[PDB]
Ligand binder design. Structure first.
Ligand code: MG
Length: 139
C-alpha cells in the first residue's frame, strides 16, 4: 500500500466527522486544534507539513486529550496506528516505555477512539489483526 497524508484525512473524517464533528486538516508549521465556529462548523485537527507521520501524531494526541511522561501514551498510539496502516514507526529507554504502553493497550484494551481508528486503518489498508509480535522490543 502507498501512504499519503490525504488518506489519513479521509480515514479520520470517516471515523469522526459525524460522531465527534471533527476533521483532519493539513496545515503549515503549527499543529493546532480549532473548534467549530459559525463559519466553519466542524472541529479541526491541524497537522504540520504534508507528512504522513505528522498527521498520525496529531491524531494520537487528539485521542488522548516531564515531556517523556506526557508523550508515552500518544507515541504508543502512534506505533499502533503505524502498524495498523502498514507504515514504519519511529532514545532506547524511552521507546521501551512506549513498547510497554503498547502492550498495556493490547492486553487491557484500546480506548474507543483509537480502537475505531485502528479498525478503519485495517480496512483501508487491508492489514491483519494486530498482534503483540508486530511490536518488537527496542534493542
Ligand atoms: Mg507529541
Amino acid at each position: 500500500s502507498t501512504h499519503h497524508y490525504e488518506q489519513l484525512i479521509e480515514i479520520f473524517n470517516s471515523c469522526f466527522a459525524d460522531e465527534f464533528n471533527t476533521r483532519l486538516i493539513k496545515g503549515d508549521d503549527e499543529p493546532i486544534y480549532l473548534p467549530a465556529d459559525a463559519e466553519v462548523p466542524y472541529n479541526r485537527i491541524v497537522f504540520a507539513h504534508g507528512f504522513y507521520a505528522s498527521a498520525i501524531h496529531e491524531i494520537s494526541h487528539w485521542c488522548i486529550a516531564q515531556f517523556e511522561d506526557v508523550e508515552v501514551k500518544p507515541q504508543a498510539l502512534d506505533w499502533l496506528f503505524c502498524v495498523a496502516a502498514g507504515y514504519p514507526f519511529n532514545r532506547v529507554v524511552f521507546q521501551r516505555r512506549v513498547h510497554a504502553q503498547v502492550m498495556d493497550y493490547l492486553a487491557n484494551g484500546i480506548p474507543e477512539r483509537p480502537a475505531r481508528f485502528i479498525k478503519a486503518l485495517q480496512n483501508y489498508y487491508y492489514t491483519p489483526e494486530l498482534t503483540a509480535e508486530q511490536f518488537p522490543w527496542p534493542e
